[PDB]
Amino acid sequence: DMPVERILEAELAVEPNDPVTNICQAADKQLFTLVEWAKRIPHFSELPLDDQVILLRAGWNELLIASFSHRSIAVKDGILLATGLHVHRNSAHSAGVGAIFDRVLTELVSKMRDMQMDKTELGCLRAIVLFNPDSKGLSNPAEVEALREKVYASLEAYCKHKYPEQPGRFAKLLLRLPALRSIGLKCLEHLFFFKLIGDTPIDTFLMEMLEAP
Amino acid sequence: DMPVERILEAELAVEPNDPVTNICQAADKQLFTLVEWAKRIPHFSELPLDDQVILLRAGWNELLIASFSHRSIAVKDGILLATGLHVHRNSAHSAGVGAIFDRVLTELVSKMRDMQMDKTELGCLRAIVLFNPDSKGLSNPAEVEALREKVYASLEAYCKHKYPEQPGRFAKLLLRLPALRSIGLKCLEHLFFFKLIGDTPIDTFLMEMLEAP
Amino acid sequence: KHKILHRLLQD
Amino acid sequence: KHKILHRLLQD
Ligand SMILES: C[C@H](CCC[C@@H](C)CC(=O)O)CC[C@H]1[C@@H](C)CC=CC1(C)C
Ligand SMILES: C[C@H](CCC[C@@H](C)CC(=O)O)CC[C@H]1[C@@H](C)CC=CC1(C)C
């Protein structure tokens, strides 16, 4: 009913001077791809359209950060954008965003790397993020909670079967979500500042995500 | 090595006009009690003193929010402070902090209530929060990560044994942590504003927690 | 309100 | 730096 194979298929289907400008341009492009990803997650497109909107508006930044982070696992001290460009921490630091960039590396990329988080696992974590029953305005929170439950049930089964010798693996994956939440919130604060101050071109879809609410 | 019984004992050992003023006064008082709690968590006092400081400075707000939230489980649409005072959502709304108060109720208290989160579970979640290996400046992150691992291992065992008919319970508990992280961050923003604007007396220990870094 | 997202999600 | 916390944690 929530087959990890479909979740993996979703990940696979979507696979590809100022670093802030380059990252923001890439985020705008990846927001289109994000919508196509979400549609491939079982039961998401059967939700009411307004709830699909709520979930993507609530989760886009965590979903995109998870994706580039896992893509960056083999990169030394940097990230790999979907555009193929590598951004090193030195460049982020020299642009005034070293602190948040270092959190990304230390709390997400290195940890994904250290445990060899696989694409099924990444896919499931993202699906958990997508199905966030705390998102405000949801027509039926319980339905989304139920979908989240089916995803983590499937993830645990996957982990226990694929990595039986690591009984804490499942918990380890779920315990990267508070870091992801914190990092996503900080990235949003930054984006709102770039918008306010005018220091960075912000493309239309990214801009829409920054619109009220 | 990380007995849930010791964790429960820690919880039990510590059990007790402007709602913002009343909440801040209570938070200041509970920060003293927090230190005494942390000392009762196995292996915490054996950490280097500087790391104990880092962990408590990084986690105090999430730890205090978890505590009042679980204390408030039987309260209708409000919270119960350690001072014994009940604060209703109507009062929070009329003080300009209704939004964050409602997140607390909807994302934490009601959810703790709905699943009947017990004190051992609360205690373990708080111990996970306390042992946050992502805290910056830690002399030995790996050691703290190891302690976090022992706590969640013990929690899962506890859950599987106490509630065998709820195989998703463990995941359900861990998946309240991203909400707790988000709510704690927002509460800090509020506190920094109250400090900036001068609208609320802030006592010495709370004030110290708001000091740099 | 959120016109790009709605359009992409429709179909 | 963080004088109250250090004092409470000591012993
Ligand atoms: C919130 C976005 C989403 C990024 C997704 C792309 C990397 C898309 C892709 O190429 O996979 C990143 C924001 C950060 C941060 C991480 C780098 C430094 C400052 C920001 C600019 C604030
Ligand atoms: C961060 C603190 C910690 C509270 C602990 C006490 C409730 C202690 C106790 O009595 O258990 C709460 C902060 C919030 C919020 C929740 C209520 C409305 C605005 C704030 C004032 C910003």
Residue numbers in the entry:
A (entry chain A), B (entry chain A): 229 to 244, 262 to 458
C (entry chain B), D (entry chain B): 471 to 481
Task: Please give sentences taken from the publication describing this entry.
Nuclear hormone receptors are a family of proteins functioning as ligand-regulated transcription factors which can sense such bioactive molecules and translate those signals into transcriptional, adaptive responses. Retinoid X receptors (RXRs) occupy a central place in nuclear receptor signaling as obligatory heterodimerization partners for several of those receptors. RXR ligands can regulate the activity of only some heterodimers including for example LXR-RXR or PPAR-RXR, collectively called permissive heterodimers in opposition to non-permissive heterodimers, like RAR-RXR, which cannot be activated by RXR ligands alone. We report here the identification of a novel bioactive form of vitamin A, which is the first endogenous form of this vitamin capable to bind and activate retinoid X receptors.
To provide structural evidence of the binding of R-9CDHRA to RXR, the hRXRα LBD was crystallized in complex with R-9CDHRA and a 13-residue peptide comprising the nuclear receptor-binding surface NR2 of NCoA2. The structure refined at 1.8 Å resolution revealed the canonical active agonist conformation common to all previously reported agonist-bound nuclear receptor LBDs with 12 or 13 α-helices organized in a three-layered sandwich. Note that the residues lining the ligand binding pocket are strictly conserved between RXRα and RXRγ and that the conclusions drawn for RXRα will also be valid for RXRγ. In silico comparison of S- and R-9CDHRA binding mode in RXRα LBP revealed that the opposite configuration at C13 leading to slightly different side chain conformation of S-9CDHRA may underlay its lower affinity to RXR, further supported by the lower relative binding affinity measured by ESI-MS. Although S-9CDHRA displays lower affinity to bind RXR LBD in ESI-MS, most probably due to the inverse positioning of the C20-carbon atom, it is also active in the transactivation of RXR in vitro with threshold concentration between 10–7 and 10-6M. Direct evidence for 9CDHRA binding to RXR was given by electrospray ionisation mass spectrometry (ESI-MS) performed in non-denaturing conditions with purified RXR ligand binding domains (LBD). Importantly, the R-9CDHRA enantiomer efficiently induces RXR transcriptional activity in reporter cell assays at physiologically relevant concentrations below 10-6M, which can be prevented by co-administration of RXR pan-antagonist LG101208. Considering that all RXR isotypes share the same structure of their ligand binding pockets, the present data obtained with the RXRα isotype indicate that 9CDHRA may efficiently bind to all RXRs and induce their transcriptional activities at concentrations found in physiological conditions. In summary we have characterized 9CDHRA as the first endogenous and physiologically relevant retinoid that acts as RXR ligand in mammals.
